[PDB]
Amino acid sequence: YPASPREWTSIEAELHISYRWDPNLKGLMRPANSLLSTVKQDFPDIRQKPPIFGPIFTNINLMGIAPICVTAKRKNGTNVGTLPSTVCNVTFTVDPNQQTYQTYTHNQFRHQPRFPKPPNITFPQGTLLDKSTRFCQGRPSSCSTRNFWFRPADYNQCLQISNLSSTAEWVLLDQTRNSLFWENKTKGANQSQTPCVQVLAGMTIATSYLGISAVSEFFGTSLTPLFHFHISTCLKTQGAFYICGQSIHQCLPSNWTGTCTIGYV
Amino acid sequence: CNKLCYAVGGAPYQVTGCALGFFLQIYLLDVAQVGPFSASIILFVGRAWDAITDPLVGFCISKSSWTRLGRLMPWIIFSTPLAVIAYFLIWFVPDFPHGQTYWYLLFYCLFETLVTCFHVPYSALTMFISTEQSERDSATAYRMTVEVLGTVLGTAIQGQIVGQADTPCFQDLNTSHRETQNAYLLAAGVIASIYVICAVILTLGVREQREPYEAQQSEPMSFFRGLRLVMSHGPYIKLIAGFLFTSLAFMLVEGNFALFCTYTLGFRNEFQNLLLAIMLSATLTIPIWQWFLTRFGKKTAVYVGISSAVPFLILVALMESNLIVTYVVAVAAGISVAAAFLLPWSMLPDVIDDFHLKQPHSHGTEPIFFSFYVFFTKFASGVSLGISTLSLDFAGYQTRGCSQPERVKFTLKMLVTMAPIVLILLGLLLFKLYPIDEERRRQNKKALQAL
Numbered sequence: 001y002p003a004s005p006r007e008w009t010s011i012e013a014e015l016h017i018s019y020r021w022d023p024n025l026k027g028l029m030r031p032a033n034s035l036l037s038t039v040k041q042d043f044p045d046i047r048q049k050p051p052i053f054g055p056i057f058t059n060i061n062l063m064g065i066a067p068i069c070v071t072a073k074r075k076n077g078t079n080v081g082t083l084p085s086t087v088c089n090v091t092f093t094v095d096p097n098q099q100t101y102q103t104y105t106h107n108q109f110r111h112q113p114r115f116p117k118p119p120n121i122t123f124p125q126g127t128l129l130d131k132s133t134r135f136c137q138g139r140p141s142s143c144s145t146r147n148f149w150f151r152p153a154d155y156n157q158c159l160q161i162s163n164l165s166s167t168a169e170w171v172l173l174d175q176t177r178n179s180l181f182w183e184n185k186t187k188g189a190n191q192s193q194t195p196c197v198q199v200l201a202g203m204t205i206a207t208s209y210l211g212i213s214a215v216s217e218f219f220g221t222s223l224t225p226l227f228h229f230h231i232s233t234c235l236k237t238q239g240a241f242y243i244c245g246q247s248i249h250q251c252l253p254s255n256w257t258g259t260c261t262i263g264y265v
Numbered sequence: 266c267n268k269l270c271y272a273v274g275g276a277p278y279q280v281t282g283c284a285l286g287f288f289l290q291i292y293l294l295d296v297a298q299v300g301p302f303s304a305s306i307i308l309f310v311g312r313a314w315d316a317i318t319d320p321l322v323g324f325c326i327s328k329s330s331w332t333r334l335g336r337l338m339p340w341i342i343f344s345t346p347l348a349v350i351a352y353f354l355i356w357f358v359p360d361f362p363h364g365q366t367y368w369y370l371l372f373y374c375l376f377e378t379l380v381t382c383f384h385v386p387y388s389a390l391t392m393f394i395s396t397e398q399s400e401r402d403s404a405t406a407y408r409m410t411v412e413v414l415g416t417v418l419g420t421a422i423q424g425q426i427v428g429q430a431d432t433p434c435f436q437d438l439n440t441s442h443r444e445t446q447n448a449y450l451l452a453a454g455v456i457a458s459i460y461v462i463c464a465v466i467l468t469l470g471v472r473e474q475r476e477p478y479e480a481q482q483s484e485p486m487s488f489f490r491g492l493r494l495v496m497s498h499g500p501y502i503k504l505i506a507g508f509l510f511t512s513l514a515f516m517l518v519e520g521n522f523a524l525f526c527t528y529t530l531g532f533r534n535e536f537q538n539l540l541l542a543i544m545l546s547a548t549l550t551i552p553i554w555q556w557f558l559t560r561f562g563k564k565t566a567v568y569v570g571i572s573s574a575v576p577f578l579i580l581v582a583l584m585e586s587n588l589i590v591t592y593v594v595a596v597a598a599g600i601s602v603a604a605a606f607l608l609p610w611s612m613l614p615d616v617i618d619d620f621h622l623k624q625p626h627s628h629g630t631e632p633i634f635f636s637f638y639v640f641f642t643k644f645a646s647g648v649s650l651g652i653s654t655l656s657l658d659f660a661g662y663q664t665r666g667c668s669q670p671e672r673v674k675f676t677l678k679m680l681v682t683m684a685p686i687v688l689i690l691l692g693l694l695l696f697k698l699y700p701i702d703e704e705r706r707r708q709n710k711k712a713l714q715a716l
């Protein structure tokens with residue numbers, strides 16, 4: 001059965017980064033090496049053990065309508081099970097085209113390298129428009145993983161999801177961090193904090209990124225791709241399996257196509 | 266007291282030659298940013314230009330007259346400032362919107378011709394500096410020992426100042442730009458200062474002696490007659506033929522060892538002064554070879570010099586690795602390459618004497634020998650690099666990476682050891698040159714009888 005919208009907040013995800021060099025690259029050895037090192041130590045908290053992919057449990061699923069399903073479609077990407085629109089209460093679609101190459105400033109480079117930003121979520125019209133002017137939920141727990149790709153610290157916005165929990169316990173989404181927070185509505189109060197890495201953020205950020213640098217050359221300057229690193233998401237808590245179609249994945253590949261909800265059993 | 270003063274002249278050429286040959290590619294790829302394409306093109310064109318300029322500068326020296334100064338010392342005088350500015354300037358990286366890459370090629374070729382213009386007269390000056398063979402051979406052995414010490418000095422200074430001179434590697438997966446630029450600039454400046462001080466101290470004392478009255482002072486032809494008569498002469502070609510194989514083998518060794526030390530049978534990812542150790546051992550050895558040639562060095566010196574490399578180098582056939590004995594092998598090879606550097610390069614004045622008395626009237630043809638000799642050294646460098654790159658390309662080394670396939674180890678092992686073993690063997694066998702101790706004394710008689 002699928003996890004509750006509050007459970008989406010509570011569950012924690014860890015991300016695993018794998019690096020691959022470019023075979024054709026034969027220059028800029030020292031600076032590219034220093035850049036790879038500084039990127040590698042840029043991500044302090046990651047999954048040490050190599051992740052495991054592929055459908056894990058594959059039971060004839062028992063489930064209710066899911067509260068949130070995430071759908072991503074790509075040209076050439078690994079496929080995971082699909083749930084129709086009826087099953088999921090609300091949907092967030094990952095759209096990679098919005099991402100563009102931004103310049104990653106490095107100390108020793110005559111031509112600064114460029115990397116692609118992570119993809120963005122989109123939502124159907126009329127679902128998150130209720131601002132309700134409630135920013136104060138912005139603060140997450142302390143997190144030391146601020147970087148070019150991944151910033152859970154910045155709290156630009158928090159907006160309500162109208163189609164969920166209008167009467168009470170309204171659920172807020174920060175699109176900037178593509179993260180979500182749940183409230184309980186009582187005058188006396190207690191409230192939890194978010195994990196360092198949200199499951200939704202881990203799902204969205206999962207794409208390979210290619211670092212490119214330009215080298216001055218005869219017949220004009222030329223473009224050389226340094227290296228590229230894949231990112232995969234894995235749940236770090238019990239259960240929390242990515243229900244997708246009939247399949248039940250434990251972790252998600254670098255580029256994943258399908259609709260997934262995180263569930264139990 | 267001039268012996269040291271002439272000997273110091275080898276260092277200004279040798280230090281720059283070593284610094285460039287070991288660091289220019291790394292600097293081009295890293296500190297400046299040039300594509301592998303243009304980097305390879307710049308290196309190949311620079312070497313080719315050096316080979317091409319060598320005979321032409323030799324001819325212009327031969328044509329040049331004695332005007333209000335030394336016969337060939339004004340060549341050093343014209344070369345030193347412009348060559349030093351070129352060597353300093355090449356290291357600096359130009360900030361330009363367009364046409365940045367050409368700058369490297371232009372100033373590399375220009376510095377190279379200027380330094381050949383320095384070197385060739387400096388090599389030729391050994392004939393003139395003093396007439397008698399004893400002081401002549403003394404001066405040339407001193408020049409050679411100071412040249413190999415120049416090799417050591419240049420490599421050591423550049424490595425220490427700019428940081429570890431290692432082949433870059435791409436770690437297997439399963440410190441500001443302006444600061445390092447300033448480091449290279451500091452290296453350029455100190456090496457340029459060494460060049461300038463060496464050239465001035467050299468020029469201060471040699472005071473070459475002009476030619477005595479010559480039997481045929483008129484009707485010399487520089488363009489054709491010199492070449493034709495040198496071709497007519499046969500021991501000179503026999504000498505260069507014998508020397509080519511030895512020099513090619515040892516330069517092949519010194520070139521490809523830089524990657525052998527890491528990839529194949531290498532327990533250290535850093536050479537860590539191993540090249541400095543072997544070259545310093547050679548610098549220490551060279552006076553021993555001079556004295557050895559005093560003690561029956563007619564051809565025994567070259568025989569023992571080339572042959573001493575064979576067993577110690579081939580001790581890689583046992584191949585069971587032990588680093589300290591491997592260092593000892595490097596020292597052995599140091600004394601072998603010391604003999605390889607000192608003997609055939611300084612045998613040449615005897616050849617030039619034998620040719621000089623054989624045909625009297627031909628005069629002023631001395632620089633042709635030295636020019637073509639250094640040209641053939643550069644040609645050996647070219648063919649060594651060519652065979653090395655072709656073999657590596659044809660077997661293994663498809664990509665530059667820290668892990669390397671097994672094939673590379675077979676090809677580069679056989680290449681580093683067995684190919685120089687057979688090459689030096691053939692060269693030494695073919696090295697039975699005409700003049701021996703008896704021949705030199707016989708030529709000596711006619712030399713002292715002339716005037």
Ligand SMILES: *[C@@H]1O[C@H](CO)[C@@H](O[C@@H]2O[C@H](CO)[C@@H](O[C@@H]3O[C@H](CO[C@H]4O[C@H](CO[C@H]5O[C@H](CO)[C@@H](O)[C@H](O)[C@@H]5O)[C@@H](O)[C@H](O)[C@@H]4O)[C@@H](O)[C@H](O[C@H]4O[C@H](CO)[C@@H](O)[C@H](O)[C@@H]4O[C@H]4O[C@H](CO)[C@@H](O)[C@H](O)[C@@H]4O)[C@@H]3O)[C@H](O)[C@H]2NC(C)=O)[C@H](O)[C@H]1NC(C)=O
Pocket residue numbers: 074076077096097099101116207208209210212214222223224225254255
């Ligand atoms: C998961 O999914 C994602 C997407 O869904 C996949 O990610 C994709 O990965 C692709 C890998 O190939 C990648 O495609 C390359 O993108 C590069 C990005 O190029 C950027 O920059 C250039 C211009 O840069 C210059 O910009 C201005 C001027 O414009 C200058 O001021 C700068 O200084 C720069 O110099 C733009 O053109 C792009 O729009 C981007 O902004 C491209 O470099 C690259 O194109 C080159 O290669 C193609 C074939 O390899 C070729 O058709 C094309 O013409 C280019 O050729 C250049 O390079 C060759 C040598 O490489 C050289 O000889 C030529 O002279 C020529 O210059 C590709 O287009 C996608 O961008 C990327 N998509 C993303 C991130 O959204 C991911 O792979 C996938 N993963 C898995 C596991 O499935």
Ligand SMILES: *[C@@H]1O[C@H](CO)[C@@H](O[C@@H]2O[C@H](CO[C@@H]3O[C@H](CO[C@H]4O[C@H](CO)[C@@H](O)[C@H](O)[C@@H]4O)[C@@H](O)[C@H](O[C@H]4O[C@H](CO)[C@@H](O)[C@H](O)[C@@H]4O)[C@@H]3O)[C@@H](O)[C@H](O)[C@H]2NC(C)=O)[C@H](O)[C@H]1NC(C)=O
Pocket residue numbers: 117118119120121148149150151154155156157175176177
């Ligand atoms: C699509 O996905 C994009 C990537 O995930 C996402 O982009 C994110 O957008 C925010 C933009 O928000 C601003 O960012 C400013 C960044 O400033 C940081 O860096 C500079 C220098 O590096 C420093 O000076 C800053 O101190 C800070 O470290 C930030 O300055 C702005 O903050 C200001 O505004 C807020 C109110 O909005 C105030 O609370 C602050 O106090 C301050 O006054 C502002 O936050 C970007 O920061 C974030 O990093 C981007 N994400 C990533 C992963 O990089 C897009 O928003 C998203 N779009 C859609 C439509 O989904």
Ligand SMILES: *[C@@H]1O[C@H](CO)[C@@H](O)[C@H](O)[C@H]1NC(C)=O
Pocket residue numbers: 076
């Ligand atoms: C998807 O990737 C595979 C692997 O490179 C390739 O063979 C296939 O043609 C790709 N699909 C395209 C290019 O439409």
Ligand SMILES: *[C@@H]1O[C@H](CO)[C@@H](O)[C@H](O)[C@H]1NC(C)=O
Pocket residue numbers: 088089090125126127162163
């Ligand atoms: C909420 O979603 C359902 C279908 O998922 C739809 O009937 C309804 O109109 C939606 N309302 C809003 C405000 O998005």
Ligand SMILES: *[C@@H]1O[C@H](CO)[C@@H](O)[C@H](O)[C@H]1NC(C)=O
Pocket residue numbers: 065067089163164165166
């Ligand atoms: C979506 O969630 C709301 C939350 O109150 C609830 O009505 C139900 O679980 C879902 N609604 C629909 C129409 O699926």
Ligand SMILES: *[C@@H]1O[C@H](CO)[C@@H](O)[C@H](O)[C@H]1NC(C)=O
Pocket residue numbers: 169184185186188189190
């Ligand atoms: C919220 O908390 C209060 C007490 O802190 C409790 O009475 C109420 O049932 C809680 N509601 C939810 C939805 O957790």
Ligand SMILES: *[C@@H]1O[C@H](CO)[C@@H](O)[C@H](O)[C@H]1NC(C)=O
Pocket residue numbers: 189190191
């Ligand atoms: C939340 O924390 C306050 C502070 O101690 C406590 O008094 C309150 O009872 C807690 N409520 C819950 C539901 O944990």
